[PDB]
Design a protein around this ligand. Structure first.
Ligand SMILES: [Cl-]
Lengths: 231, 225
């Protein structure tokens, strides 16, 4: 019964209870040390979570391991942890309560690993390799970090000329970068706060890089007022 | 929208930037935006969205955000809205989203948070009252640890409920069999018990045992303390 109570505590962001109830559960059902690690991560306790994670070796454990390492800025270890997964040197997580299983990581969701790998390479001083992970990630699925970094580098992969409001956001961005289209700016101006906050923000940045400081400040000023806390 | 499944997936991966972005595209499901913003550590931003709402779930996250920002009077006010029943039922939403919502029948959580807020806010006695009322419904960590600390845990005349029993007993008996019993579960439940033990010992002036207990946990679980 401790499981349902732990889930309920997570849902209420009552993490101390979840950590305590998790601690009680370690003996009975060891197939749950992952859960302890997660709740500890959620509570901002990365060094403690790592202690439990070292005792494990699954895709989910190595993933949270990388997250904890990243919080601690140990990028080399963060990277090593992720590669274990992508290189397929981890075991399948245990069959567990269904409510717990949902919190687990599927090795088929490689967008998330390549994305994190992109961030790590970048933060670690390997920008070009990072871009390569962002590219490989974006190839499977839209995620925020690969998209924003690829747009920033103008290195987003395009067809010869797949769907979604976000994929349209990317299309517009690629186009605006090379065209500075005012119709595009006006289109996204109406959605601030919202998707427009990102588009106009990126617009302002492009303008600066082009020396057009006037439009650059206009764009920034807009977001600063309609969404001051975004920036 | 297919955007839902993707947001859940991003939360599960702790890729919150993506979830915030995808949430921004989706903008009533404004609760979801508030949550993901809360998870990403962005309380002031989450409040902006939360002000636009009035449900049990919204007022709850409102209180959490306020508590992070140490605005205890507002945190308290937000919670009371729920307990006083001045909020609407959350919208019927995608099932994956519904799960992240707060049920007004889970009052242990509200009274517990209320206990923390009264305490942090300088009203210890009232806080104890919320802890007591919370503990009456269900074991939660903060009411239990504060009630044990104050020796104000309610007694008559689960493994966790056994932990509480042992703690009540050890407080008045200093039972060495109890200490030895929980000494084997460090790290674990023992870390709490022995840590509480060490505290009781100090309050009794028995500094020798107090340090023994603390030292134990410092070594078998240095990062607990
Ligand atoms: Cl969660």
């Amino acid at each position: 019964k401790l499981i349902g109570k732990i889930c309920k505590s997570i849902r209420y962001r009552d993490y101390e209870t979840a950590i305590f109830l998790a601690a009680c559960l370690l003996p009975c059902k060891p197939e749950y040390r992952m859960l302890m690690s997660i709740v500890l991560y959620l509570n901002g306790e990365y060094t403690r979570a790592l202690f439990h994670l070292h005792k494990l070796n699954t895709c989910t454990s190595k993933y949270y391991e990388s997250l904890c390492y990243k919080k601690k800025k140990d990028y080399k270890k963060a990277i090593k942890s992720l590669e274990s997964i992508l290189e397929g040197k981890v075991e399948r997580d245990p069959d567990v309560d269904a409510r717990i299983q949902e919190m687990f990581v599927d090795p088929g969701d490689e967008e998330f690993f390549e994305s994190l790998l992109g961030d790590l390479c970048t933060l670690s001083g390997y920008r070009e390799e990072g871009i390569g992970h962002y590219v490989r990630s974006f190839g499977k699925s839209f995620l925020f970090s690969p998209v924003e970094n690829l747009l920033l580098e103008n290195k987003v992969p395009q067809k010869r000329d797949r769907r979604g409001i976000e994929e349209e956001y990317v299309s517009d961005s690629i186009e605006f970068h090379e065209s500075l289209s005012p119709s595009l700016v006006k289109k996204y101006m109406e959605h601030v706060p919202g998707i427009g906050s990102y588009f106009i923000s990126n617009a302002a940045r492009r303008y600066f890089n082009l020396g057009m400081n006037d439009k650059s400040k206009a764009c920034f000023e807009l977001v600063r007022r309609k969404d001051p806390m975004f920036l």
